[PDB]
Amino acid sequence: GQICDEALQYAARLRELEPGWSATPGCQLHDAEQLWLDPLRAQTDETFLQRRLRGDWPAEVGNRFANWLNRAVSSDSQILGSPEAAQWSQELSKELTMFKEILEDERD
Amino acid sequence: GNAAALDVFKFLSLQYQGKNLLNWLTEDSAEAVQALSDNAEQAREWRQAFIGITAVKGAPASHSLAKQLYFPLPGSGYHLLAPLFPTSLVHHVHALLREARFGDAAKA
Amino acid sequence: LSTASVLAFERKLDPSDALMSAGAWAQRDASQEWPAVTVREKSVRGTISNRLKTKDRDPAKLDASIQSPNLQTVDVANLPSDADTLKVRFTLRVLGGAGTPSACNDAAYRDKLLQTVATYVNEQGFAELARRYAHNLANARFLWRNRVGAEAVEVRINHIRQGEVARTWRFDALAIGLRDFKADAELDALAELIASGLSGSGHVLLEVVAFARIGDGQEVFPSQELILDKGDKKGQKSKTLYSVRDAAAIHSQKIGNALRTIDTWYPDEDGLGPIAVEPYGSVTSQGKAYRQPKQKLDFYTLLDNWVLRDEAPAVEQQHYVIANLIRGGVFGE
Amino acid sequence: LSTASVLAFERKLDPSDALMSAGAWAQRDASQEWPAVTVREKSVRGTISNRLKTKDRDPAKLDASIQSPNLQTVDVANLPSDADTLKVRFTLRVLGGAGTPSACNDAAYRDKLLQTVATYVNEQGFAELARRYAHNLANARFLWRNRVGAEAVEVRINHIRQGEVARTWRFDALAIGLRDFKADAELDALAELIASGLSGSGHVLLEVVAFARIGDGQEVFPSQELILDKGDKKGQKSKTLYSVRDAAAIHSQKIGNALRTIDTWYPDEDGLGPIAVEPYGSVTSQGKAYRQPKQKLDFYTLLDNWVLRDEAPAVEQQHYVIANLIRGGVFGE
Amino acid sequence: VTDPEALLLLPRLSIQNANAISSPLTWGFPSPGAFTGFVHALQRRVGISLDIELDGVGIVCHRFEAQISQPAGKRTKVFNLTRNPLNRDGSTAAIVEEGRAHLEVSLLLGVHGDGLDDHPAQEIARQVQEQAGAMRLAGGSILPWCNERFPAPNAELLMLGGSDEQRRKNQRRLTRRLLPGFALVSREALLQQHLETLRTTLPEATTLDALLDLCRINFEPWQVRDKPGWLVPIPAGYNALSPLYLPGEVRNARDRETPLRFVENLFGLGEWLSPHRVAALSDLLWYHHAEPDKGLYRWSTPRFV
RNA sequence: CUAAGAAAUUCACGGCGGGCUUGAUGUCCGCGUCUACCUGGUUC
DNA sequence: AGGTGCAGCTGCT
DNA sequence: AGCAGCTGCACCT
Cα C275 to Cα C281: distance, rounded to the nearest angstrom: 8
Please give the tally of structural domains in chain E.
2
Which residues share a beta bridge with D244?
D247
Comparing CA positions, the residue from C189, C200, C166 lying closest to residue C94 is C200
Interatomic CA–C1' length for residue E74 and nucleotide F14, angstroms: 32
Which residues, including other chains, have CB under 8 Å from residue C173's CB and lie 6 or more apart? C138, C139, C140, C147, C153, C154, C155, C210
Same domain for E209 and E164? no
Exposed/middle/buried for residue D132 (C-beta within 10 Å: 0-12, 13-18, 19+): buried
Comparing CA positions, the residue from D326, A36, D200 lying closest to residue C148 is D200
Q: What angle do CA C60, C62, C64 make, to 5 degrees?
A: 75
Comparing CA positions, the residue from C202, C187, C216, C193 lying closest to residue C83 is C216
Cα D197 to Cα D207: distance, rounded to the nearest angstrom: 15
Comparing CA positions, the residue from D235, D225, D252 lying closest to residue D77 is D225
Per DSSP, the residues of chain E read -PPPSEEEEEEEEEEEEEES--SSS--SSPPHHHHHHHHHHHIIIIIHHHT--EEEEEEEEEEEEE-EE--TT-S--EE-B-PPP--SSSS--------EEEEEEEEEEEE-SSTTTTS-HHHHHHHHHHHHTTS-SSSSPBP---SSS------EEESSSS-HHHHHHHHHHHTGGG-SSEEEEE-HHHHHHHHHHSTTT---THHHHTTTSS--------------S-EEEEEEEEEE-S----TTTSBT-S-TTS-EEEEEEEEEEEEEE-GGGSS-GGGS--EEEEETTTTEEEEE--S--
Comparing CA positions, the residue from C331, C332, C241, C181 lying closest to residue C17 is C241
Same domain for E190 and E43? no
**Contact (Cβ atoms closer than 8 angstroms) between residue D173 and residue D138:** yes
Cα C127 to Cα C124: distance, rounded to the nearest angstrom: 8
Comparing CA positions, the residue from C324, C229, C214 lying closest to residue C276 is C324
Same domain for E255 and E177? no
**Contact (Cβ atoms closer than 8 angstroms) between residue D77 and residue D14:** no
What's the half-sphere exposure (Cβ side, CA atoms, 13 Å) at A78?
3
The DSSP symbol for D28 reads T
- The identity of residue B87, as a single letter, is T
**Contact (Cβ atoms closer than 8 angstroms) between residue E159 and residue E5:** yes
Nearest residue of B to residue E40, measured between CA atoms: B72
The DSSP symbol for C216 reads S
**CA dist list (Å): C210 to B30, C83, C155, C171:** 82, 16, 4, 10
CA–CA min distance E272, chain A (Å): 12
Domain boundary among the residues E150, E181, E212 is at E181
Same domain for E121 and E138? yes
**CA dist list (Å): E225 to A72, E28, E61:** 19, 23, 27
Provide φ and ψ at B8, rounded to 5°.
-65, -30
CA–CA min distance C25, chain E (Å): 20
- The identity of residue D125, as a single letter, is G
Interatomic CA–C1' length for residue C244 and nucleotide F42, angstroms: 50
Cα C21 to Cα C153: distance, rounded to the nearest angstrom: 15
Which nucleotide's C1' is closest to E41 (Cα)? F1
- The identity of residue C301, as a single letter, is T
Same domain for E187 and E124? no
Cα E263 to Cα E243: distance, rounded to the nearest angstrom: 10
Cα distance between the two ends of chain B = 41
CA–CA min distance E90, chain C (Å): 5
**Contact (Cβ atoms closer than 8 angstroms) between residue D23 and residue D232:** no
Beta carbons within 10 angstroms of residue C100's beta carbon: 14
Which residues share a beta bridge with D250?
D18
Comparing CA positions, the residue from C66, A78, C10, A73 lying closest to residue E136 is C10
Exposed/middle/buried for residue A67 (C-beta within 10 Å: 0-12, 13-18, 19+): exposed
Query: Does the CA dihedral E196-E197-E199-E204 come out positive or negative?
Result: negative
E70 touches chain B (CB under 8 A): no
Cα D311 to Cα D314: distance, rounded to the nearest angstrom: 9
Kindly provide the residue ranges of all beta strands, DSSP E only, lying in chain A, ordered along the sequence. Answer: none
H runs (alpha helix) in chain C? 61-66, 108-123, 127-133, 135-138, 187-198, 252-259, 299-307, 317-327
Same domain for E116 and E9? yes
Exposed/middle/buried for residue C78 (C-beta within 10 Å: 0-12, 13-18, 19+): buried
Cα distance between the two ends of chain C = 13
Comparing CA positions, the residue from D86, D108, D95 lying closest to residue D7 is D108
Query: Does the CA dihedral B21-B26-B27-B31 come out positive or negative?
Result: positive
Query: CA gyration radius for chain E?
Result: 22
Backbone region of residue C295 per phi and psi (left: phi > 0; alpha: psi in -120 to 50; beta: other values): beta
Cα C233 to Cα E75: distance, rounded to the nearest angstrom: 15
The resolution, in Å, is 3.1
**Contact (Cβ atoms closer than 8 angstroms) between residue D21 and residue D35:** yes
Name the residue among E89, E147, E253 with its Cβ closest to that of C207.
E147
Q: Which helix (H) or strand (E) holds C103?
A: strand C103-104
Beta carbons within 10 angstroms of residue D17's beta carbon: 25
**Contact (Cβ atoms closer than 8 angstroms) between residue E163 and residue C111:** no
Local structure of B27: helix, strand or coil: coil
Same domain for E168 and E37? yes
Domain boundary among the residues E159, E181, E203 is at E181
- The identity of residue C165, as a single letter, is V
- The identity of residue E21, as a single letter, is I
Nearest residue of B to residue C8, measured between CA atoms: B64
Q: If DSSP states are collapsed to H, E and C, what string results for C139-192?
A: CCCCCCCCCCCCCEEEEEEEEECCCCEEEEEEEECCCCCCCCCCCCCCHHHHHH
Interatomic CA–C1' length for residue E88 and nucleotide G11, angstroms: 24
Cα E171 to Cα D269: distance, rounded to the nearest angstrom: 87
Cα D28 to Cα D26: distance, rounded to the nearest angstrom: 6
**Contact (Cβ atoms closer than 8 angstroms) between residue C199 and residue C96:** yes
Local structure of C306: helix, strand or coil: helix
What's the half-sphere exposure (Cβ side, CA atoms, 13 Å) at E241?
11
Cα D127 to Cα D319: distance, rounded to the nearest angstrom: 10
Kindly provide the residue ranges of all beta strands, DSSP E only, lying in D161-267, ordered along the sequence. Answer: 167-172, 204-213, 236-239, 243-244, 247-250, 261-263
**Contact (Cβ atoms closer than 8 angstroms) between residue D289 and residue D280:** yes
Domain boundary among the residues E162, E181, E200 is at E181
Q: Quote the domain boundaries for residue E157.
A: 4-181
Cα C123 to Cα C142: distance, rounded to the nearest angstrom: 32
Name the residue among E78, E90, E144 with its Cβ closest to that of C288.
E90
**Contact (Cβ atoms closer than 8 angstroms) between residue D262 and residue D277:** yes
Which nucleotide's C1' is closest to D44 (Cα)? F19
Kindly provide the residue ranges of all beta strands, DSSP E only, lying in chain D, ordered along the sequence. Answer: 7-9, 13-15, 18-23, 40-46, 70-76, 85-94, 103-104, 152-160, 167-172, 204-213, 236-239, 243-244, 247-250, 261-263, 275-276, 282-283, 288-289, 329-330
Q: How many CB pairs under 8 A join C and E?
A: 93
**Residues in chain E, how many?**
305
Exposed/middle/buried for residue E22 (C-beta within 10 Å: 0-12, 13-18, 19+): buried
- The identity of residue D285, as a single letter, is S
What's the half-sphere exposure (Cβ side, CA atoms, 13 Å) at D136?
22
Q: Maximum CA pair distance of chain C?
A: 75
Cα distance between the two ends of chain A = 25
- In chain C, % helix, strand, coil (3-state, to 5) comes to 25, 25, 50
Local structure of C100: helix, strand or coil: coil
Chain B segment 52-71 residues within 8 A of C by beta carbon are 63-65
Cβ C293 to strand H below 7 Å: yes
> Strand G: which positions are within 7 A of a protein CB?
1-5
Same domain for E133 and E9? yes
Local structure of D188: helix, strand or coil: helix
**CA dist list (Å): C252 to C211, C235, E20:** 19, 29, 17
Please list every residue in chain A whose beta carbon sits closer than 8 Å to the beta carbon of residue E172.
105
Same domain for E143 and E48? yes
Cα D220 to Cα D148: distance, rounded to the nearest angstrom: 11
Same domain for E37 and E51? yes
Same domain for E249 and E169? no
Interatomic CA–C1' length for residue C276 and nucleotide H7, angstroms: 28
**Contact (Cβ atoms closer than 8 angstroms) between residue C327 and residue C277:** yes
Comparing CA positions, the residue from D74, D230, D237 lying closest to residue C234 is D230
Comparing CA positions, the residue from D300, D280, D291, D303 lying closest to residue D99 is D303
Cα D193 to Cα D206: distance, rounded to the nearest angstrom: 10
Cα E139 to Cα E38: distance, rounded to the nearest angstrom: 10
Taking an 8 Å cut-off on Cβ atoms, the answer to whether C287 and E90 are in contact is yes
Which residues share a beta bridge with D40?
D76
Provide φ and ψ at E60, rounded to 5°.
-110, 120
Cα E120 to Cα E6: distance, rounded to the nearest angstrom: 13
- In chain B, % helix, strand, coil (3-state, to 5) comes to 35, 10, 55
E24 touches chain B (CB under 8 A): yes
Same domain for E293 and E151? no
Give how far the C-alpha of residue A15 lies from the chain's centroid of Cα atoms, to the nearest Å.
Answer: 13
